[PDB]
């Protein structure tokens, strides 16, 4: 009852395309089907639909963000870069 | 007359089947049959206190 | 053609009425050359093209 | 088109105005117990609605036929 060993969600692709493409797909396929925490809302209820739009089933809140994840590591660090500059323009 | 003999269980040996077992009766159908019977029995036994709500749960996950 | 335009049905009517044998008494007129309707039509031989 | 049940209103209908016609039907129905009774249906052609009234009791029925304005052309059976 373990089912697979490596492939997982990507048993779907069977044998085609070859390991690495299938491999890298798997990683992001898993990101985009994940259920994420809600900022405003607390609940683990943010599901994806269409690249970048991320909306909370429970409280109907929608966030812009990553194509395959809620929040870019690049967006994240820029978040901080911005606040950092902001706190300076009011100190 | 034949349909009669069929439910006397008569014309369905191993050489009277052309469909896979799954094809003639689907497994998922069986399960849903089997499952809802258990769900319903566990329900009745709760609205009757033959078993407590706590045991129920356990048996509900167990079914 | 089932649901048709007036204009065509219009032409269809004229096309039906042209379609008959030459009036026999015309063959009795004086100095008459005509013998038959040499412009007769029939839906299974020569089409109308609308 | 409409069923009527008030015995007061039905009479208010039999005159009305637009009412110039009505009809009287007799159904040989059966009751739940299974005894041959005589249901009689009273129908009045409105102007855009057929008000019909159902009376199971033959009594208040064969009374009511003689309760209509006699200036009303009534079809019988």
């Amino acid at each position: 009852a373990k089912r697979t060993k490596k492939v997982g969600i990507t048993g779907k692709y069977g044998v085609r395309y070859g390991s690495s493409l299938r491999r890298q797909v798997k990683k992001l396929e898993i990101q985009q089907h994940a259920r994420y925490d809600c900022s405003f809302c607390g609940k683990k209820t943010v599901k994806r639909g269409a690249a970048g739009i991320w909306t909370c089933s429970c409280c109907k809140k929608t966030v812009a963000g990553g194509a395959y994840t809620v929040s870019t590591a690049a967006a994240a660090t820029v978040r901080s870069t911005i606040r950092r500059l902001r706190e300076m323009v009011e100190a | 007359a034949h349909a009669q003999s069929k439910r006397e269980g008569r014309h369905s040996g191993y050489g009277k089947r052309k469909g896979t077992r799954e094809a003639r009766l689907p497994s998922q159908v069986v399960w849903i049959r089997r499952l809802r019977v258990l769900r319903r029995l566990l329900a009745k036994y709760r609205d009757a206190g033959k078993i407590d709500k706590h045991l129920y749960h356990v048996l509900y996950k167990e079914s | 053609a089932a649901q048709k335009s007036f204009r065509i049905k219009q032409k269809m009517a004229k096309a039906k009425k042209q379609n008959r044998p030459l009036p026999q008494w015309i063959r009795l007129r004086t100095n008459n050359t005509i013998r038959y309707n040499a412009k007769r039509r029939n839906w299974r031989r020569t089409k109308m093209n609308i | 088109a409409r069923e009527i049940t008030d015995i007061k209103q039905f009479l208010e209908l039999t005159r009305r105005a637009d009412v110039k016609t009505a009809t009287v039907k007799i159904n040989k129905k059966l009751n739940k117990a299974g005894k041959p009774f005589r249901q009689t249906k009273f129908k009045v052609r409105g102007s855009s609605s057929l008000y019909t009234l159902v009376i199971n009791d033959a009594g208040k029925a064969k009374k009511l036929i003689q309760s209509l304005p006699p200036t009303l052309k009534v079809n019988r059976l």
């Binding site: 692709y13 085609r16 395309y17 493409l21 890298q24 797909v25 992001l28 396929e29 405003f40 269409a50 690249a51 970048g52 739009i53 809140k61 929608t62 966030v63 812009a64 963000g65 990553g66 194509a67 395959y68 994840t69 929040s71 870019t72 690049a74 967006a75 820029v78 978040r79 870069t81 911005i82 500059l85 902001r86 300076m88 323009v89 | - | - | -």
Partner: protein
């Protein structure tokens, strides 16, 4: 020979953009008194997905300064901005992610999106899923600000050019393999008739300068003068060099 395929694009026709399912065009608000001087607040009424454009869109609706009504503008959602977020726009609008500020009102190091090239042209640079431009410095000598554009080149533009704080949403789309022709098909099914692509070397001569066949080979250099005439411009155009490099970075 015959008019080659790349010339045949210019007459539009078969090759126009498939735009039925698009929202509207994405633009910034028209630069008016409010945004010229102070700021103006709006609510993002929904964030939505434009067809043929990874990167979602923000329908954020402002009131009308000059009349009783609501005016919906179509913004490109800048990642993290959400429904119900308030969107303040103008010279005096504070440094939060989503607002749209002139390029003079932002400190060096600020990163922004959907920036105008001339003030009031309502958006121009950094608009593709995940992109952004970075202010590097300022200059009162004409209201100008120097930025870093996603391509890497630096451009000096008016400080009255607006941008919207932050990075375009739509994340790292290209990080995921298309896997199969089908997926690419649908991709361009919503953009434009450019797929698949027939290699010219598989053409006959009459369709392409490469199409000269009998062994599939380009025959002469594949690197064409900038001054060559349409009909000859196929391949590596005014290429100032060719081949593999590992170039790491760009123009700093």
């Amino acid at each position: 020979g015959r008019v080659i395929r790349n010339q045949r694009k210019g007459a539009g026709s078969i090759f126009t953009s498939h735009t039925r399912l698009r929202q509207g065009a994405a633009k910034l608000r028209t630069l008016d008194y409010a945004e010229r001087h102070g700021y103006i607040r709006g609510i993002v009424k929904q964030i939505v997905h434009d067809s043929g454009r990874g990167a979602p869109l923000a329908k954020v609706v402002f009131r009308d300064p000059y009349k009783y009504r609501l005016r919906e503008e179509i913004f490109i959602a800048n990642e993290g901005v959400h429904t119900g977020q308030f969107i303040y726009a103008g010279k005096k609008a504070s440094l939060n992610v989503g607002n749209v500020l002139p390029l003079g009102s932002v400190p060096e190091g600020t990163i922004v999106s959907n920036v105008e090239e001339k003030p009031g042209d309502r958006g121009a640079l950094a608009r593709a899923s995940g992109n952004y431009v970075i202010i590097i410095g300022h200059n009162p000598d004409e209201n100008k600000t120097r930025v870093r554009l996603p391509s890497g080149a630096k451009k000096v533009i008016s400080s009255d050019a607006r941008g919207v704080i932050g990075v375009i949403a739509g994340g790292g789309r290209v990080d995921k393999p298309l896997l199969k022709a089908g997926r690419a098909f649908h991709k361009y099914r919503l953009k434009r008739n450019s797929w698949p692509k027939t290699r010219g070397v598989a053409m006959n001569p009459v369709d392409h300068p490469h199409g000269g066949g009998n062994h599939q080979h380009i025959g002469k250099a594949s690197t064409i003068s900038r001054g060559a005439v349409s009909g000859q411009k196929a391949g590596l155009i005014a290429a100032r060099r060719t081949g593999l490099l590992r170039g790491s970075q760009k123009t700093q």
